Structure 1
């Protein structure tokens, strides 16, 4: 590590202290004992502790605040990642090791809201990393194009329900883009947390979205992760949604080599998406229980569920519509993950029905 870097790190660490109102896991776990212990480390690709915490330092409002420039970062800066991963994922020790991929008995899933008075839509996604490629911050503009090439090709061989067209962000009309974002299909453009983590370089080169005409199956290309395999649709038919995602992933996995860590499961750019990389969500309306986003969040937390705005994380709820999903992704199976969301939603719906 050079000198200019340490200057910004020492300056960054101090900033986290003078932010009495900062509640990010970064501040909560980057002790002076942890800071000094690794701030002088660098990875084979030149990633430093600054490339890891820069986003959380510049955005005190972050909930986590860090990212892994390359797979090696997860271990080079273990002292910092390890405790953050443990806290977030509901308890993941140092000796712990994520379990083997297990979709589970899909047949055991049920409809989330029959009467259809609360649930608007259901969605489940996973994240994958192409072997041979580092994470965003370590990518060259040429690598974004290479990766875009590989993924688009592999997806052109999707058949039946999973058959669709790849739409590059480069050349996409502002109208088409804005609509796909507003319809909750396409990832938003320019996220401050990602920008400051240098995850958006050369934008929009190599970025794109693949999806079948129904747009119930989608693959985000080069946003936060190399790939994001999405399955979504209106209603609470979690069974179908999950089943579809499973089909897609198993198929895609037989064609593209994805990075998998003996301990962290499937590797991702961010620590909250490790392991199963699964975020099973629903856009739900709970008028009585959501009489204060805060009281709703306290309820959901008891079920290991997370609450997000209608347009995604770091956004507000629009017209009572909230994004509730399983928070944990590492330390449990795909099946267990999707189940925490299922079980959690079923109870909250009940609590809502009995609510005064």
Structure 2
């Protein structure tokens, strides 16, 4: 912390939020800032650090990042209401329930003429270590060691290889961009304002299995980002492999180091960005929906079905994923995607024939 800050009136340190569009700017009042300015977490993370992402970027919707598990409680005055609004009324008294039971996922296979690929991604942080905005090189390397040792322990169709981002041959970097496996190196304003780019590429890397359907990015925005993906529409298969991977990686880490994933009854899994709390899950498809793209109801229809659509901007190809993360389970979110993409595909198919979809539109 800058030790002379505490000597100035808090009003002199209060961010100027004129022109800001963030939940940070909405909830961090003058009086709240003066209350918490000089309160640090047990690892040394400060209020200013926590909000720097929003203060530097008035166009961001959220504006906050956690530096450690305790950020969420030490600064609960700020984090609680931002989480409540972002997550559609999820109160400090509400609690989050996990459900990783792959037997409960809808077994429909999404039509592969429309669904290019199906994916389930999540994040996990290791309890006992600071999060990316705050983590130091020794912490980050320890995380790298434990996570990569757990991944290198996977066998059969989960057998793979770890690729450190520091150790990278030229026939290597090219190949991984080739599969598109490489995470963007951290130049966006979101990563640099949030302290998350420090030391790059030290401590970061990418693990994938040989069959290229299970992939883990290490020490990016969360200590791990775990992704199961495959061609076509068999979402239940993707989820089953996701859960087995997750289970075995967790087991290895606990058996070898005693460490566990950050998690609590209130927030479920703790992630760096409050937008990702709860399940941390982005369950998506890449779907070819060019008639839906020409339809002015497309965003509204997605929203009503609890889906987000994200395009490249081409082709009418959209990433379609779950909007909801906190206060519903993984099983619910994945099934929401399956149910809703099924409807989009049926609509796309009617529109190709110049037929009505008006009766398929959700209430």
Aligned residues: 343
Kindly state the Cα deviation for residue 175 of structure 1 after the two structures are TM-superposed: 6.0
Aligned-pair RMSD on alpha carbons? 2.5
Task: Compute the displacement of 1:27 (Å).
Answer: 3.0
TM-score, normalised via structure 1 length: 0.87
2:80 alignment counterpart: 82
Answer whether contact 1:58 1:196 (CA < 8 A) is retained: yes
Counterparts in 2 of 1:335 and 1:69: CA distance versus 1, 3 Å: same
Alpha-carbon deviation of 1:307?
2.7
| Offset from partner CA, 1:130-157 (integer Å, 9 cap, x none) | 1221101221112222211111111111
The 1:107/1:335 distance shift into structure 2, 3 A limit, reads: closer
Distance 1:148 1:198, change over 3 A: same
- For residues 98-145 of structure 1, what are the alpha-carbon distances to aligned partners after superposition, in whole Å with 9 as ceiling and x for unaligned? 114443534533112x2x332211110121111221101221112222
State the alpha-carbon separation in 1 of the partners of residues 69 and 11 from structure 2: 21
**Where in structure 1 are there 5+ consecutive unaligned residues?**
310-315
Deviation digits for residues 14-59 of structure 1 (CA, Å, limit 9, x no counterpart)? 1x32x1xx43333343344544443342211221221111112212
Mapped pair 1:141 → 2:137: yes
Q: Distance in 2 between matches of 1:244 and 1:228?
A: 15
For 2:346, which of 332, 350, 355 is the aligned residue?
350
Is 1:277 the counterpart of 2:303 in the alignment? no
2:359 corresponds in structure 1 to none
Q: Summarize the alignment of residues 87-106 of structure 1 with structure 2, pairs less than 5 Å apart.
A: 87-106=85-104
2:310–2:318 Cα contact (<8 Å) kept? yes
Is 1:237 matched with 2:240? no
Unaligned runs of 5+ in 2: 254-259, 355-363
1:124 is paired with a residue of what secondary structure?
strand
Q: Which has the larger radius of gyration?
A: 2
SS in 2 for 1:186: coil
Counterpart in the other structure of 1:312: none
Provide closer, same or farther for how the CA distance between residues 10 and 270 of structure 1 changes in structure 2, counting only shifts above 3 A: farther
State which of 307, 315, 319 in structure 1 corresponds to 2:309. 307
Q: Deviations over 1:142-181 (max 9, x none)?
A: 2222211111111111011111001101122466435534
